[PDB]
Amino acid sequence: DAGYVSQVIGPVVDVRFDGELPSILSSLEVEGHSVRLVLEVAQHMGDNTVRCIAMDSTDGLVRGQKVVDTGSPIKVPVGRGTLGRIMNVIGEPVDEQGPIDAADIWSIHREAPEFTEQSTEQEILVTGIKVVDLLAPYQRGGKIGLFGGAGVGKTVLIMELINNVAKAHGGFSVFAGVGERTREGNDLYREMIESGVIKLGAERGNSKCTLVYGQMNEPPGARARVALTGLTVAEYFRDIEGQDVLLFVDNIFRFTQANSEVSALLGRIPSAVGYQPTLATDLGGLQERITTTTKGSITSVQAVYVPADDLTDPAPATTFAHLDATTVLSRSIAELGIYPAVDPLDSTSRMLNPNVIGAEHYNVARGVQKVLQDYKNLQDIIAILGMDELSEEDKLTVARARKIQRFLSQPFQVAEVFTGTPGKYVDLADTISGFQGVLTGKYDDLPEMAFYMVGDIKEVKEKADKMAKDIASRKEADNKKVSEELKDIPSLDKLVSEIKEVVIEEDDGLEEDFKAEALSSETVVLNEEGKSVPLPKKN
Amino acid sequence: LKLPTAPLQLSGTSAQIATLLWQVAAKENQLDKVQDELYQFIELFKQHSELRRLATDPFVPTLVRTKIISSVLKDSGASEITKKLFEALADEGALSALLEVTVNYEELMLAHKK
Amino acid sequence: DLVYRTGQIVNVPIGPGTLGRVTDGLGQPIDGKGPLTNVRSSLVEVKAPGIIARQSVREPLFTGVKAVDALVPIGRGQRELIIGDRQTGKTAVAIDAIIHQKNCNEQVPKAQRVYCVYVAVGQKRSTVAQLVKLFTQTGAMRYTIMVSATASDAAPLQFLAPYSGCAMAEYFRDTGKHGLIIYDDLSKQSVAYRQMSLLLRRPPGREAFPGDVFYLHSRLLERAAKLSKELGGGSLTAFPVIETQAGDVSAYIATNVISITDGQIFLETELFYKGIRPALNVGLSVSRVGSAAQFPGMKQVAGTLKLELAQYREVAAFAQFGSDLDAATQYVLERGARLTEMLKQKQFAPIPIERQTVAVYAATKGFLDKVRVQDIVAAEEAVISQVNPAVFKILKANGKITPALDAHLKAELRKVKLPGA
Ligand SMILES: Nc1ncnc2c1ncn2[C@@H]1O[C@H](COP(=O)(O)OP(=O)(O)OP(=O)(O)O)[C@@H](O)[C@H]1O
Numbered sequence A: 001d002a003g004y005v006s007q008v009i010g011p012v013v014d015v016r017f018d019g020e021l022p023s024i025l026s027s028l029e030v031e032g033h034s035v036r037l038v039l040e041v042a043q044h045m046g047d048n049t050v051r052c053i054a055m056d057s058t059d060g061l062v063r064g065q066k067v068v069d070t071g072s073p074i075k076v077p078v079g080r081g082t083l084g085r086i087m088n089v090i091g092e093p094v095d096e097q098g099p100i101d102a103a104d105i106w107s108i109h110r111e112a113p114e115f116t117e118q119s120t121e122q123e124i125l126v127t128g129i130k131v132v133d134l135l136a137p138y139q140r141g142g143k144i145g146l147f148g149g150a151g152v153g154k155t156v157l158i159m160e161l162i163n164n165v166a167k168a169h170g171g172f173s174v175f176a177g178v179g180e181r182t183r184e185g186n187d188l189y190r191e192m193i194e195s196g197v198i199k200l201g202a203e204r205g206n207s208k209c210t211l212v213y214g215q216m217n218e219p220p221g222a223r224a225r226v227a228l229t230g231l232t233v234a235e236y237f238r239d240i241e242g243q244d245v246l247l248f249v250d251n252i253f254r255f256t257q258a259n260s261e262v263s264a265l266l267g268r269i270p271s272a273v274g275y276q277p278t279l280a281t282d283l284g285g286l287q288e289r290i291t292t293t294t295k296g297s298i299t300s301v302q303a304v305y306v307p308a309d310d311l312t313d314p315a316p317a318t319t320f321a322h323l324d325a326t327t328v329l330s331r332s333i334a335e336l337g338i339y340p341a342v343d344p345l346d347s348t349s350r351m352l353n354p355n356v357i358g359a360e361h362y363n364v365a366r367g368v369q370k371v372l373q374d375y376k377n378l379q380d381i382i383a384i385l386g387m388d389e390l391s392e393e394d395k396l397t398v399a400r401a402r403k404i405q406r407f408l409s410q411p412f413q414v415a416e417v418f419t420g421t422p423g424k425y426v427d428l429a430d431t432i433s434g435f436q437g438v439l440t441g442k443y444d445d446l447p448e449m450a451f452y453m454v455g456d457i458k459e460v461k462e463k464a465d466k467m468a469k470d471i472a473s474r475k476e477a478d479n480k481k482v483s484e485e486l487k488d489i490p491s492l493d494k495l496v497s498e499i500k501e502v503v504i505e506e507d508d509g510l511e512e513d514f515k516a517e518a519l520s521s522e523t524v525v526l527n528e529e530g531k532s533v534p535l536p537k538k539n
Numbered sequence B: 001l002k003l004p005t006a007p008l009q010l011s012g013t014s015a016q017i018a019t020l021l022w023q024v025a026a027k028e029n030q031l032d033k034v035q036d037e038l039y040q041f042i043e044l045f046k047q048h049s050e051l052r053r054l055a056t057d058p059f060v061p062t063l064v065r066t067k068i069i070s071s072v073l074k075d076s077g078a079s080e081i082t083k084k085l086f087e088a089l090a091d092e093g094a095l096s097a098l099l100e101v102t103v104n105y106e107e108l109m110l111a112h113k114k
Numbered sequence C: 001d002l003v004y005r006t007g008q009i010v011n012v013p014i015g016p017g018t019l020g021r022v023t024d025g026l027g028q029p030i031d032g033k034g035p036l037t038n039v040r041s042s043l044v045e046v047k048a049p050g051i052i053a054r055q056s057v058r059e060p061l062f063t064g065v066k067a068v069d070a071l072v073p074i075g076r077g078q079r080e081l082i083i084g085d086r087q088t089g090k091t092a093v094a095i096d097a098i099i100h101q102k103n104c105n106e107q108v109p110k111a112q113r114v115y116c117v118y119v120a121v122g123q124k125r126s127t128v129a130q131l132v133k134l135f136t137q138t139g140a141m142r143y144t145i146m147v148s149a150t151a152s153d154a155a156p157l158q159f160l161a162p163y164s165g166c167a168m169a170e171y172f173r174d175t176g177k178h179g180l181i182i183y184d185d186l187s188k189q190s191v192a193y194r195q196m197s198l199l200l201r202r203p204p205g206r207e208a209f210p211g212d213v214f215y216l217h218s219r220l221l222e223r224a225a226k227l228s229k230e231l232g233g234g235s236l237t238a239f240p241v242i243e244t245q246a247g248d249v250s251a252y253i254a255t256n257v258i259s260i261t262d263g264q265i266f267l268e269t270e271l272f273y274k275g276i277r278p279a280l281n282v283g284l285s286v287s288r289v290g291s292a293a294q295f296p297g298m299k300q301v302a303g304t305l306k307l308e309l310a311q312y313r314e315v316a317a318f319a320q321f322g323s324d325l326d327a328a329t330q331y332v333l334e335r336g337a338r339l340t341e342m343l344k345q346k347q348f349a350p351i352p353i354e355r356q357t358v359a360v361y362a363a364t365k366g367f368l369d370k371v372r373v374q375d376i377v378a379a380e381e382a383v384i385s386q387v388n389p390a391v392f393k394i395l396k397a398n399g400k401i402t403p404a405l406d407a408h409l410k411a412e413l414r415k416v417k418l419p420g421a
C-alpha cells in the first residue's frame, strides 16, 4: 500500500505505487532519508508511477527506498502560533525556538477564491514615499509589484515598505521570502527582532509577523512552493480570523524560475525564452489567491526580478496583469543617484483615476509625468547642443523637470546604514503640495540639487539656505590659528605611544582541535555483502 | 559465457531475444522443440482474448501478469527454456514481442538447417 | 567492466593539511609532495548555513585594490562577483586579494587571519603553475590552497571542483577562522556542467544549458556566509569570476550569478585600454553590503570620492568640446580626472588600507589640484613615501581618522613635495 523510489534524476523523483496511486499535489514522505525529505506529486506517469518534485535535496536516495503517502498536500501550521516564527516550505521551524503550536494544519494547495467573493473597493495606501504616493499610488487591499533588475533597489524598497506600512498597521503580516539571499533574510529577521515586530519567548503572541523562507540554496521544489506556504499563512488570517493581512513576497520571479528548473525533467518540452509551457497558468494559480475577498484583505507587495532589466521577458511581463500598482525601478534612474530608482514614466496604478484620488492629486501627477516626458523628448537636443538653442521656450520645462527628478528622490530609514542621511516619511498632502509647487513655478528660483535627497518642500528650502551658508565658507578655512599642530592636537610621535601593541603569534592555531583521519592510499569499495574491501586486482 | 554462435547476426531487442533463445536451445539441442513451443503460443494468442489481454492492456498489474503466466506453465511439459522465457517477458511486459521473436527465431532455425 | 560502489557520497580531504597544496577537483594532490597528511574526509555537497546560523556582515576584507576598498567595499562573508570580458583584470583582482591577505596575516592575531582558496576551473596547467610560482615567491602559499581542475581534466572534475574548493574552505568557516574562496571561471564550471548534463540526455534549455544551472551556482555561492557567535563567528568570502562576451551581461550565467551574489565588480575592456587599471566600471559596480563593511576613515573619504566621480561621469559625454571653459563643470572634470588617475594601480602589489585611505584623502581634500592629470601615479607614490610612517601606525590602530590626526597629516601633506606645478 506504500510506494518505492523508481528513478532519481536530480531534484525529480519517480515513485512506483503497487495499487492506489496518490493524487496529484499529494505530499509523500521518503522513509529512511537522513534529513526529512518530502516529495510532492506532480503527475501520474502512467505505469503505476507518480513523478514528484522534492522539497529537499535527493542525494542519498536509493532506488527502492520506501515512500509513504500522506494522502493530502503539503500541510503547514497556521494561526497565531506562527507569528514571530520562521517557517520552512513544509512548515518546519528554522528559527530554533521549538515546535510550532498550531491553530490548524492547512493544506498549501487551494483554489483561488471565486468571482462572487471579490471586493471592488479601492482606497489608497499611503506609504510615505514621494514618487509612490504621487505617480503610482498603492491600493489598500490590492496587489503591488516592484519590478527591477538585479541591484536597483527592490529589496531596500520592500524593507522601506515593511517599516513604513506594516509597522503602524492593525493586522498581521507575512513575509514570504521566495528564493532570495539568506544573508538578507537573516538581516530582515534581526531588523524585526530589534524593532519589536517579532518578539521572542513569552512575548511571542505579541509578534505581528510570520516569516516563511525558501531561499536560494534550497532545491527548486522548495522554492516553487514556499510562496504557496506563505500565502497559506496569509489565507488563514484572511479567511478564518477575518482581518487585514500584509503579504510581502520578495522575488516572485523565483517561483517561476524554480518551476522552470524542474519543468524539463517533468517531461515538458520548453516554451519560449526557456521557461515552462505552464508559465502563465502557474503564475495565475498562485497570484489569483492573493486577493482581497469579502472576508478579509491581503494587500500584497511583490518584488519581481526583471532578468537583465529586460521587461519584455515572459516572467516579468506575465505578472504585470496580476497587479494593481506596478513600481518599475530603473537602472537609468539609479546611476543618476536618485533613490528610490522608480521610473516615473513606467510606474502605473489603478488608483490613478480622478474618481478615486481626486482631481487635484491626479492633475499634479499627470503634470509631473507630462513635464518629465517632454524633458525626455528634449534630451536628444540638450545632450547634443547645450541648452542655448531653446531660448526659454522649453527651458523652463528642463529647469522644472530637473527639479522634479531630484524631488522624486528621497532618503530611506532602512538605507541610513548605507546613506549618511536619516530617513524621511512624507505625507500625501505634503508631497502633492510640494510637486504642485514645482510644476507651477512657485519654487523656480531655488538651486537644482537642493531638491536631491530631501524630505519635503520645507526641506528643499532648509537645504537651500544650508548651501547658501556653505558656499560662503569655501573662501577661508585655512589659517587664523585654526588647523595648526598645537591648536588642539598633540605631537605626532606621542600618538604612536598612545596606541598599545596587539600580540601576534604566526603559529596560526589550526591544529588546536583538529581530529584527523588516516586517508586511504588506495580506493576502498563494497563487495556484494556490503563490506569495505579494497579494490580487487581483477581489472 | 560459452554459448554456440548464432547462424546469422540480426537486428535489435527483438531478434536479440530470438538469438539468445536460439543460443540456449542449441546447448540443450532443443532447437526444434521450442520452435514448436513458440508456434503453439501464437495459436494460443489467436484463441483466447483473456490471454492477449496480458500483452496489450496496460492496466493489468505486473504482478498479475507474472503470476498467470507462471500459474499456467507449471505443467504440460513445456521446455524449461520457454517457461523461463515467458517469465522474463511477463516481468517486463514484453509479451507482445513473441510475434516478432518467432519470426526472428525462424530464420535462425532456417540458417541452422541451411 | 565491473563497477563497485564505494558507499560514499563524494568526499574531499579538508583540514589544516590542505594549506599549501595544489589539489585537483577531487582532492588528490598534484604538486608532487606526497599525500595529504593532516586532514579528514568531509562531504562535497553540504547544505548552506541557515538563517539562524548567520550574523550580519560587519568587518571588512581588504583587497588591497584601491578601487574596491573605496568604491566596492567587501565584507567578511559576502559574495562579490568579478564579472568582465577576457583579459580585463579579473584574475588580477583575485590574486591581489590573496596576496594582500598574506600581507595582512602577519599583522593580525590568529583570530583575524584569512586563509585563501583558489579554485581554477577550466584554465591551463601553465597558468595554474604560474600562479603557484607567484604565490610561493610572494609567500602566499602558507595560507593558500589551490584546487585546480584544468582544461584537460574531465567535465565532472571541473563541475565538482568549486564544491571541492568550497568544502576545503568551509573548514575555516566552521572552525571559527576566516576563509576567502575564489572560483576562477565559474562560467567554465557551467560549461562543464552543461556538457555533463547534455551527455546524460537531460533536456537542454536556454543556450543549451540545463534547467538547474541556477541551482548549480546558488547552492555553491550560498555556502559563503558570516556565521553567528554560537557557531564560531567564522566567515567565508566568495569571489566568483564570470567572463562575458563583449560586455554582454545579459547572458544566462552572467544574469544568474549577478542575481545570486551580493555585489559585482564589473570591469570593462574599454576602460582597460584607457589606462584605467584595474578597469573598474564605477557606475555598474555595486556592493550590497554597502558601506556597512567599510574601513572607517576610508568611509570618510569614500562618499566624497563616489560623489565627485558621479559628477565627473555625468558632466562627461560633453568633455569632447574642450573649447568652452565653463569653470564650474571644468573644475569637476579635472577634479574627477585627479580621482580617476588616483585609482590606477600596478598589479601584484596590493596597498595596505592605511596608505589607500591616505592617498584618497590627499585627493579628496584638494592637495593634488596643482599636479596635472598625467602625473599622479608618481605623485601618490611621493606622498606615500614622503609622509612619516607613523601616520599609518596610528591610522591602522585608531580605526578612523581621529581629530588628533586629521590636522597632523593636514600639515604633513603640505610639507612634502608633489611632482607637478
Ligand atoms: N592593474 C593592472 N595593472 C597592469 N596590468 C594589469 C592590471 N590588471 C591586469 N593587468 C594585465 O592585464 C591582463 C589581464 O589578464 P587577467 O589576469 O585579467 O586574465 P582574466 O581576464 O582574468 O582571464 P583571461 O585570461 O581568460 O582573460 C594580464 O596580462 C595582466 O598582467
Ligand SMILES: Nc1ncnc2c1ncn2[C@@H]1O[C@H](COP(=O)(O)OP(=O)(O)O)[C@@H](O)[C@H]1O
Pocket: A148, A149, A150, A151, A152, A153, A154, A155, A156, A157, A339, A340, A410, A411, A412, A415, A418, A419, C286, C287, C288, C289, C290
Ligand atoms: N533608497 C536607497 N538609498 C540608497 N541606496 C540604495 C537605495 N535603494 C537601493 N540602494 C542601493 O542599491 C543596492 C541594491 O540593493 P538591493 O535592493 O538588495 O538590490 P535588489 O533590488 O536587486 O535586491 C543596495 O545595496 C544599495 O546600495
Ligand SMILES: [Mg+2]
Pocket: A154, A155, A180, A181
Ligand atoms: Mg534582492
Ligand SMILES: [Mg+2]
Pocket: C090, C091, C184, C185
Ligand atoms: Mg582568468
